[PDB]
A paper describes a structure:
Here, we use single-molecule optical tweezers to study the folding of consensus-designed tetratricopeptide repeats (CTPRs), superhelical arrays of short helix-turn-helix motifs. The packing of the TPR motif results in superhelical structures, which means that, of all the different repeat-protein types, TPR arrays most closely resemble a physical spring. The starting point for this study was a consensus-designed TPR protein (referred to as CTPRa) that adopts a superhelical structure within the crystal lattice. This superhelical geometry of the TPRs is established through stacking of the A-helix (Ai+1 in Figure 1A) of a given repeat against both A- and B-helices of the preceding repeat (Ai and Bi in Figure 1A). The resulting angles between repeat planes then give rise to the pitch and diameter of the superhelix.
We used X-ray crystallography to determine the structure of a construct composed of 4 repeats of the new variant and a C-terminal solvating helix, CTPRrv4, to 3.0 Å resolution. CTPRrv4 crystallized in the P3121 space group with two molecules per asymmetric unit. As was observed for CTPRa, the C-terminal solvating helix was not resolved due to a higher preference for end-to-end stacking between molecules in neighboring asymmetric units. The resolution was sufficient to determine the change in repeat plane angles using the Cα coordinates: while the twist remained almost unchanged, an increase in the curvature is compensated by a similar decrease in bending. Although these changes may at first appear insignificant in the context of a 4-repeat array, they translate into clear differences in the longer superhelical arrays, leading to a decrease in helix length and increase in helix diameter. Furthermore, when compared to other CTPRs, all of which exhibit backbone RMSDs within 0.72 Å, the CTPRrv backbone differs by 1.4 Å relative to the CTPRa backbone. Circular dichroism spectroscopy of the 5-repeat proteins used in this study shows that the CTPR α-helicity remains intact in the new repeat type. Whereas CTPRa variants unfolded and refolded at a plateau force of ≈12.5 pN, the plateau of CRPRrv was significantly lower at ≈9.5 pN, indicating that the introduced mutations have a destabilizing effect. Importantly, the overall lower stability of the rv-type arrays relative to CTPRa arrays is due to a larger destabilization of the intrinsic energy than the destabilization of the interfacial energy (ΔΔGunit ≈ 3 kBT and ΔΔGnn ≈ 1.7 kBT, respectively). On the contrary, a single CTPRrv repeat is unstable (1.1 ± 0.2 kBT) and requires the energy from the interface with at least one more helix to fold.
Numbering used by the authors: 3 to 136
The structure:
């Protein structure tokens, strides 16, 4: 399944999303509890705009590893892209509970608050993000 994963990665990198979904799904048939295949699938579904399928494989990935800040963040992103800001915040906060120094989670939390109109919170979360790396 590592070869199938690699094939999917290449097509995914070159934007051939439907070919990438094929190869990731083939990796899941060999190891149905493959974290990399499950995460990579949610990645392609998110990039495609299939937000229900992205949630499906992102929630499947969090079942096997509830400490994937990368998946926790991408689940929040998928919820933000479908306008569910309450769920998106909940997931960015889950990613910050795990790692309070997550620059993408802090940046994404400021982004959602800006979209919401809570600019006082947005400035607070954006400041936290720059307080890490210049």
């Amino acid at each position: 399944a590592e070869a199938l994963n690699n094939l999917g990665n290449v097509y995914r990198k070159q934007g051939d999303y439907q070919k990438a979904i094929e190869y990731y799904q083939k990796a899941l048939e060999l190891d149905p509890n493959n974290a990399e295949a499950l995460n990579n699938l949610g990645n392609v579904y998110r990039k495609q705009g299939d937000y229900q399928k992205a949630i499906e494989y992102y929630q499947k990935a969090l079942e096997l590893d509830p400490n994937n800040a990368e998946a926790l963040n991408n689940l929040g992103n998928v919820y933000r892209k479908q306008g569910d800001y309450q769920k998106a915040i909940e997931y960015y906060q889950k990613a910050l509970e795990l790692d309070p120094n997550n620059a993408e989670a802090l940046n994404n939390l400021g982004n959602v608050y800006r979209k919401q109109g809570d600019y006082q919170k947005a400035i607070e979360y954006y400041q936290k993000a720059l307080e890490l790396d210049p």
